Paper text:
We focused our attention on human RAD51, an ATP-dependent recombinase crucial for homologous recombination (HR) and for error-free repair of DNA double-strand breaks. We therefore explored the possibility of using a more stable orthologue as a surrogate and focused our efforts on archeal RadA from Pyrococcus furiosus, a protein that was already structurally characterised and is closely related to human RAD51. Here, we describe the complete process of generating robust, RAD51-like surrogate systems from this archeal protein via two distinct approaches: by stepwise mutation of the surface of the RadA to humanise the BRC4 binding area (HumRadA series of mutants) and by generating an archeal/human chimera (ChimRAD51) in which all of the BRC4 binding part of RAD51 is stabilised by parts of RadA.
The humanisation series could have ended with HumRadA22, which displays a fully humanised BRC4 binding surface. The crystal structure of HumRadA22 confirmed the success of the humanisation process and shows good agreement with the human RAD51 structure. The structures of those mutants, where the LFDE site has been humanised (HumRadA14 and 22), show good correlation with the human BRC4–RAD51 complex in this area for the backbone but some variation in the side-chain conformations. Despite extensive efforts, we were unable to obtain a crystal structure of a complex of a HumRadA mutant with a BRC repeat, and differences in the BRC4 binding site are likely to reflect the unliganded state of our proteins. Whilst it was possible to obtain apo crystals of the fully humanised mutants (HumRadA22), the crystals were difficult to grow and handle and hence not well suited for drug discovery purposes.
Author numbering: 108 to 285, 311 to 349
């Protein structure tokens, strides 16, 4: 029942989030294409695996890809640049591609089954990534008349994500193309993260960089 924390790689971004990404909660990052959402997702996929003193929870990660954003070659560079074995870091990230919105919900029943199997092991799942959470729902429910249903399907998927985060004590990290964090391009390849409407965290901004290590100050 202790709320775990995952470092994002950047200490200024971790400060804004009150210590990092929370287990038993969903953290949403939104912004335009190229604002760093997937780089943050890839950095977290590595960070989670690290011991607490280094910013992780000694866990494994699951990655649900909706629009082919997963880059194992990028995860290998981040693992290498942080002094880890890239093939071992890769082995600890379960990847699954969602082809449609209904397949996306079905993937959560598979994540649930996988989480149970790895629960007693020395490396339980501590992170679930959903890259471009809303892309399939917007593709399939177009126009004024399918707005009610899209919102209904989306709310249902969010209810499911909340249940998994609470019963397995995992962080859920979701990305959303343009807890909520707005990402934006800053000056000189810098990125600005702005925290919006957090109940117990003040609004503020955090500037960070995209490097060979993924995300850092």
């Amino acid at each position: 029942a202790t709320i775990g924390r995952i470092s994002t790689g950047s200490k200024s971004l971790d400060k804004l989030l009150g210590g990092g990404i929370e287990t038993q909660a969903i953290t949403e990052v939104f912004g335009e294409f190229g604002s760093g959402k997937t780089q943050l997702a890839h950095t977290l996929a590595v960070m989670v695996q690290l011991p607490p003193e280094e910013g992780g929870l000694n866990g494994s990660a699951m990655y649900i890809d909706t629009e082919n954003t997963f880059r194992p070659e990028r995860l290998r560079e981040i693992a290498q640049n942080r002094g880890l074995d890239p093939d071992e870091v890769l082995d600890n990230v379960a990847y699954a591609r969602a082809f449609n919105s209904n397949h996306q919900m079905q993937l959560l029943y598979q994540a649930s089954a996988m989480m149970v199997e790895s629960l007693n092991t020395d490396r339980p799942y501590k992170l679930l990534i959903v890259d471009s959470l809303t892309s399939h729902f917007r593709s399939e429910y177009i126009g004024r008349g399918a707005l009610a249903e899209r919102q209904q399907k989306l709310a249902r998927f969010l209810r499911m994500l909340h249940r998994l985060a609470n019963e397995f004590d995992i962080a859920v990290f979701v990305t959303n193309q343009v807890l909520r964090v707005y990402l934006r391009k800053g000056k000189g390849g810098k990125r600005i993260a702005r925290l919006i409407d957090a109940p117990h965290l003040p609004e503020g901004e955090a500037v960070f960089s995209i490097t060979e290590k993924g995300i850092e100050d």
